[PDB]
Design a binder for this molecule. Structure first.
Ligand SMILES: *[C@@H]1O[C@H](CO)[C@@H](O[C@@H]2O[C@H](CO)[C@@H](O[C@@H]3O[C@H](CO[C@H]4O[C@H](CO)[C@@H](O)[C@H](O)[C@@H]4O)[C@@H](O)[C@H](O[C@H]4O[C@H](CO)[C@@H](O)[C@H](O)[C@@H]4O)[C@@H]3O)[C@H](O)[C@H]2NC(C)=O)[C@H](O)[C@H]1NC(C)=O
Ligand code: NAG
Ligand code: NAG
Ligand code: NAG
Ligand code: NAG
Ligand code: NAG
Ligand code: NAG
Ligand code: NAG
Ligand code: NAG
Ligand code: NAG
Ligand code: NAG
Ligand code: NAG
Ligand code: BGC
Lengths: 347, 208, 224
C-alpha cells in the first residue's frame, strides 16, 4: 500500500574523485557511489498510473544540471540585464557521465516495464527499484543525444497530440549515429556533422509512419523551425566544452523520406555547423561570451535516440500535418528518460 | 469543426439566452463574451467550470459533441457577442441584442424584378422585401419554376425601429443574365409567426 | 495581477507591414506561452500563433505562415508581432493573450486592451444604382413599395436619401453586405400609397463620399 508523493531524492554516479572533468567534479561532491547490486523487485498483479509530464523527478534533475553548469562553465563575460560579470575564462574538460536518481527511506520508485508505454496512463507491468538507470545530463535541442532506445517499437510521446502547444517526443527504437567534428587546421569556427543518410531516412520514414495512426492517414511532412534563438532554430549541443550549432535543414528533407528509390541523395549527409563564442545561457537569462575554440581535432560521436517535434496548428480542412524540430525546454530532455519512473510513499 | 448557433439572438432584459456549439474533435471547450468596444472576457472553461468574477447566472452544459451556454437573467451588460472555443479554433459567434417586445406583426411582402439597366451589364438581382414585422424570426425562401434554391440569396435585417419596434428584411437573389433568361417564374415564399400560411409573392419574367 | 499592455492602434495601406508590441507584468515572462488573436467584425476570432519566451519558440497559424513574425525581448518583458504585405482583409483588432495558468494555454483569461489596425486602400469604386420599380397596377387604397439598389461599391459607407431628404417616412436603408467580389452592396426601399404613384415623383439620392460620387435615379413603375 502506498500513495503518490514528492520527496527530496539523492543522485548516484561512478564519478572519479581525481578526475578534472567538469561533471565528475560535481558528482564527486553531490552524488554517492553506485549500488553494485540493483534490487529490482517485480510487483504481482499491480496497475499504477504514470504521468511522464507531471513528474516531480524531472524538476529535481533540472535544478541539479543547472547547478552543475553554474559552477562548471566559466564564461569570460556574462551579460544578464544591466549587469556585467567578468571572470577567468579557462578551457575545461567536458563530458557528461551517467547519473542515477535514488529514493530516501520511506519512499520507493515504481518502474514501468510495458514495452510500448507512451508516458501517460495505466501500466500493467510495474516493478520496484531503489534507483533509476544511468541518465546522461546531455543538453541539446531538436535531437536527443546519448539516451535510451525504445524497447519494442517507436513511441510518439505527448501530453496531448491534439494540443499543438504540447511538445512531442519521438522515441526511436534504433539509434542513429551522428559524427560531429571540427578538423584541426579557413576558419577555426566552422565544423560539420556526418550522419548515415541511408540509415537515417529509413528510420525517419518509420517515424512518419508512427505519426500517422495518431493523426489519421494524413501526409506527415517536416519543415525547419519557424523562428527563435539560434539555440532553437539549430541543433545546439556542447561537445568537449565548445558550443556547437548545427544546421539540420537537410536532415529533415521530405523527398528523401520517400527513400532514394529514384532520388539522388545517398551516402552520408554532412550538416553545416559552427562553434559560437557568444551564446544565450539556457540555465538562467542573459548572454555569455566564451574563449575561441581549442586547436586540434574536436570530435564527438553521439547516439540520436530521440527527436523533439512541434506540430503546426490553424487549418482543419487540410489533408496533412506539419512538424518542426522543437526544443527550448530542457526539462523535456529529462522527461525522455524519467518517463517510466514514479515516486511513491509507503504507508 | 466548431459550428455555433444561432447567428443572432434577439431577447429582452429578463429572459434566458441559449447558445449552442457542436464540436467534433477531442478538446476542452470554453466560452467568451465581448461587449462593444471592450476586449473579450472569459466566461466558462473546461465545459461548465465558471470563471473568476462571473455571476452564477452563466452556466454551461454538454451532451457529447453538443455544448450549451446559457444566461439565466440578461442585463444591460450581458448583451454582446459570444464565442465558443476549442484549442486554437473559435466559432463564428452569437450576437445577443435587446428586442423591445410588442404585439405580433405580419411582414408585408414585396418583390422586385431585375432592372433592364442591370441586365445590359452582366448579372441580374432579384429583391424580396419584408417590411414592418415582429418578431425578427422570419424565413425567406426563393423558388424558381417552383424549385427550391439555396446558396445564392443573401439576407439583411434592419435594426428594430425605435418607434413601432418592428423589423425589415431584404432578401437579394443574385443570378447571371444568361441563367436569368432560361427560367420564367420567380417567387419568394415567406413564413412568419404572424402568418397563418406561407405567403408567396411572384412575377413572370418579361411581362409586367 | 497579470496585465498585458499593448501598443497603440495603427493605420496602414495595402503592401505595408505593421508591428505591434505587448508588454507583460505581474508574472514570470518566460513561464507562460503568449498568443495573438485578431478579431474582425463579421468573422471568427483568429488565432495567429503562440510564442514561448523561453527560447523564442514559436508556432504560426498555417494560413498566416510566411507573412507573420513573432519575437520577444526577454529582459524587457515585451513581446512583438509583425505582419507583412498587408491587405484590406487584415483590418481588425489584434490582441495578445495568456492562458488562465501556465499549464493549459487555451483558456485565455488574460487579454490586452487590443490594438486596432485599419488597412485602407487608395483604390475606390463608385456605386451602380439600379431602380427597384414599384409595379404597374395602382389602387386608391392599396400600398406600394419602391427603392434603389446601391450595388458594387468600395469601400463603405454609402448614404441614400429620398427626394433630397423630403421623404423620410417609410424609408428603410438596409445594412451593407459584403459580396463575394469584395465589393459592398445594399438596398434602400420606401413604402408609399399606391395612389401616389401617379402624383408624386420618387428619386433616390445615392452618395458615396470616398469617391466623390453622387447619383440621382428616378424610380418609376415598369413602363409596360
Ligand atoms: C441546449 O439547449 C437546447 C435548447 O434548449 C436543448 O435542446 C432541447 O432539449 C429539450 C429537452 O431538454 C427538448 O425539449 C423537447 O420538447 C419536445 C416538444 O416538442 C415536440 O414537438 C416538436 C415539433 O414537432 C418535436 O420536434 C419534438 O420532438 C416534440 O415531439 C418534448 O416532446 C420533449 O419531451 C422530452 O421529455 C419528455 C418527458 O417530459 C419525453 O417524453 C420525451 O421523449 C422527451 O425526452 C422535450 O422536452 C428540445 O426538443 C430540444 N431542442 C432542440 C434540440 O431543438 C439541448 O438539450 C441543450 N444541450 C445540452 C447539451 O444541454
Ligand atoms: C494475480 O492474478 C493472476 C491471474 O490474473 C494469477 O495467475 C496470479 O497468481 C495472481 N497473483 C497473486 C499471487 O496475487
Ligand atoms: C497514451 O495512452 C493513453 C491510454 O493509456 C491515451 O489516453 C493517450 O492518448 C496516449 N498518449 C499518446 C497520444 O500517445
Ligand atoms: C513484465 O516485463 C518483464 C520484462 O521487462 C517480464 O519479464 C515480466 O514477465 C512482465 N511481467 C508480467 C506481469 O508479465
Ligand atoms: C522499431 O519500430 C518499428 C515500428 O514502429 C518497426 O517497424 C521497426 O522494425 C523497429 N525497429 C527495430 C530495430 O526493432
Ligand atoms: C567521424 O568522422 C571523421 C572524419 O571527419 C572520421 O575520421 C571518424 O572516424 C568518424 N568517427 C566515427 C566513429 O565514425
Ligand atoms: C549506412 O548504413 C547502411 C546500413 O545498411 C550501411 O550499409 C552503409 O554502409 C552505411 N553508409 C555509410 C556510407 O556509412
Ligand atoms: C541552414 O541552412 C539553410 C540553407 O540550407 C538556410 O536556409 C537556413 O537559414 C539555415 N538555418 C538557420 C536558421 O541558420
Ligand atoms: C531534398 O532533396 C532533394 C533531392 O536531393 C533536393 O532536390 C531538394 O532540394 C531537397 N530539399 C531541400 C534541401 O529543402
Ligand atoms: C555521447 O557519448 C559519447 C561517449 O559516450 C561522447 O563522446 C559524446 O560527446 C556524447 N554526446 C554528447 C555531446 O553528450
Ligand atoms: C550508441 O549506442 C548504440 C546502441 O544503442 C551502439 O550501437 C553505438 O555503437 C553507440 N555509439 C557510440 C559508439 O557512441
Ligand atoms: C488532454 O486534454 C484533455 C482535455 O482537453 C484532458 O482531459 C486530458 O487529461 C489531457 N491528456 C492528458 C493525459 O493529460
Ligand atoms: O539576439 C542576439 C542573439 O541571438 C541568438 O540567436 C544567438 O544565439 C546569440 O548568440 C545572440 O546573442
Amino acid at each position: 500500500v502506498w500513495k503518490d508523493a514528492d520527496t527530496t531524492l539523492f543522485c548516484a554516479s561512478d564519478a572519479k574523485a581525481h578526475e578534472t572533468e567538469v561533471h565528475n567534479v560535481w558528482a564527486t561532491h553531490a552524488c554517492v557511489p553506485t549500488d553494485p547490486n540493483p534490487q529490482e523487485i517485480h510487483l504481482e498483479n499491480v496497475t499504477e498510473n504514470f504521468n511522464m509530464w507531471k513528474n516531480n523527478m524531472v524538476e529535481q534533475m533540472q535544478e541539479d544540471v543547472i547547478s552543475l553548469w553554474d559552477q562548471s562553465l566559466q564564461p569570460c563575460v556574462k551579460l544578464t540585464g544591466g549587469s556585467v560579470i567578468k571572470q577567468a575564462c579557462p578551457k575545461i574538460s567536458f563530458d557528461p557521465i551517467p547519473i542515477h536518481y535514488c529514493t530516501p527511506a520511506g519512499y520507493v520508485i515504481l518502474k514501468c516495464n510495458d514495452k510500448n508505454f507512451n508516458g501517460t496512463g495505466p501500466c500493467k507491468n510495474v516493478s520496484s527499484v531503489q534507483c533509476t538507470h544511468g541518465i546522461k545530463p546531455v543538453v541539446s535541442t531538436q535531437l536527443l543525444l546519448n539516451g535510451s532506445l525504445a524497447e519494442e517499437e517507436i513511441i510518439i510521446r505527448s501530453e496531448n497530440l491534439t494540443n499543438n502547444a504540447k511538445t512531442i517526443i519521438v522515441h526511436l527504437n534504433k539509434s542513429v549515429e551522428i559524427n560531429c567534428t571540427r578538423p584541426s587546421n579557413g576558419d577555426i569556427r566552422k565544423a560539420y556533422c556526418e550522419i548515415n543518410g541511408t540509415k537515417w531516412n529509413k528510420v525517419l520514414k518509420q517515424v512518419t509512419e508512427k505519426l500517422k495512426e495518431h493523426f489519421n492517414n494524413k501526409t506527415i511532412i517536416f519543415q525547419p523551425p519557424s523562428g527563435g534563438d539560434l539555440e532553437i532554430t539549430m541543433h545546439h549541443f556542447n561537445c568537449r566544452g565548445e558550443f556547437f550549432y548545427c544546421n539540420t535543414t537537410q536532415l529533415f528533407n521530405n523527398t528523401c523520406i520517400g527513400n532514394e528509390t529514384m532520388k539522388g541523395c545517398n551516402g552520408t549527409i554532412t550538416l553545416p555547423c559552427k562553434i559560437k563564442q557568444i551564446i544565450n545561457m539556457w540555465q538562467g537569462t542573459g548572454q555569455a561570451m566564451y574563449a575561441p575554440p581549442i586547436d586540434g581535432k574536436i570530435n564527438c560521436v553521439s547516439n540520436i535516440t530521440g527527436i523533439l517535434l512541434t506540430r503546426d496548428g490553424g487549418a482543419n480542412n487540410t489533408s496533412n500535418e506539419t512538424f518542426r524540430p522543437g526544443g527550448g525546454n530542457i526539462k523535456d530532455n529529462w522527461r525522455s528518460e524519467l518517463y517510466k519512473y514514479k515516486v511513491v510513499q509507503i504507508e | 469543426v466548431l459550428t455555433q448557433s444561432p447567428g443572432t439572438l434577439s431577447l429582452s432584459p429578463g429572459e434566458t439566452a441559449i447558445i449552442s456549439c457542436r464540436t467534433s474533435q477531442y478538446g476542452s471547450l470554453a466560452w467568451y463574451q465581448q461587449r462593444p468596444g471592450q476586449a473579450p472576457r472569459l466566461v466558462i472553461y473546461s465545459g461548465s467550470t465558471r470563471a473568476a468574477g462571473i455571476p452564477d447566472r452563466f452556466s454551461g452544459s454538454r451532451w457529447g459533441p453538443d455544448y450549451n451556454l446559457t444566461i439565466s437573467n440578461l442585463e444591460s451588460g450581458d448583451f454582446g457577442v459570444y464565442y465558443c472555443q476549442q484549442y486554437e479554433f473559435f466559432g463564428q459567434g452569437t450576437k445577443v441584442q435587446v428586442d423591445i417586445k410588442r404585439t405580433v406583426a405580419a411582414p408585408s411582402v414585396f418583390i422586385f424584378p431585375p432592372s433592364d439597366e442591370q441586365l445590359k451589364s452582366g448579372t441580374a438581382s432579384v429583391v424580396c422585401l419584408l417590411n414592418n414585422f415582429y418578431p425578427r424570426e422570419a424565413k425567406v425562401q426563393w423558388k424558381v419554376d417552383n424549385a427550391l434554391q439555396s446558396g445564392n440569396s443573401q439576407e439583411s435585417v434592419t435594426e428594430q425601429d425605435s418607434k413601432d419596434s418592428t423589423y425589415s428584411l431584404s432578401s437579394t437573389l443574385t443570378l447571371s443574365k444568361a441563367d436569368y433568361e432560361k427560367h420564367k417564374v420567380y417567387a419568394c415564399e415567406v413564413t412568419h409567426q404572424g402568418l397563418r400560411s406561407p405567403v408567396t409573392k411572384s412575377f413572370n419574367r418579361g411581362e409586367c | 495581477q497579470v496585465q498585458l499592455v499593448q501598443s497603440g492602434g495603427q493605420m496602414k495601406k495595402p503592401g505595408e507591414s505593421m508591428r505591434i508590441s505587448c508588454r507583460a507584468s505581474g508574472y514570470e515572462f518566460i513561464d507562460c506561452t503568449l498568443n495573438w488573436i485578431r478579431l474582425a467584425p463579421g468573422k471568427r476570432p483568429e488565432w495567429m500563433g503562440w510564442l514561448k519566451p523561453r527560447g523564442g519558440a514559436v508556432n504560426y497559424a498555417r494560413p498566416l505562415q510566411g507573412r507573420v513574425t513573432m519575437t520577444r525581448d526577454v529582459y524587457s518583458d515585451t513581446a512583438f508581432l509583425e505582419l507583412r504585405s498587408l491587405t484590406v482583409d487584415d483590418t481588425a483588432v489584434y490582441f495578445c493573450t495568456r492562458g488562465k495558468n501556465c499549464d493549459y494555454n487555451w483558456d485565455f483569461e488574460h487579454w490586452g486592451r487590443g490594438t486596432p489596425v485599419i488597412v485602407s486602400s487608395p483604390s475606390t469604386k463608385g456605386p451602380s444604382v439600379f431602380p427597384l420599380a414599384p409595379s404597374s397596377k395602382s389602387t386608391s387604397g392599396g400600398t406600394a413599395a419602391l427603392g434603389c439598389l446601391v450595388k458594387d461599391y468600395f469601400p463603405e459607407p454609402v448614404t441614400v436619401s429620398w427626394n433630397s431628404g423630403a421623404l423620410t417616412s417609410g424609408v428603410h436603408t438596409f445594412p451593407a453586405v459584403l459580396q463575394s467580389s469584395g465589393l459592398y452592396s445594399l438596398s434602400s426601399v420606401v413604402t408609399v400609397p399606391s395612389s401616389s404613384l401617379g402624383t408624386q415623383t420618387y428619386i433616390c439620392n445615392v452618395n458615396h463620399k470616398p469617391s466623390n460620387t453622387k447619383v440621382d435615379k428616378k424610380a418609376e413603375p415598369k413602363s409596360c
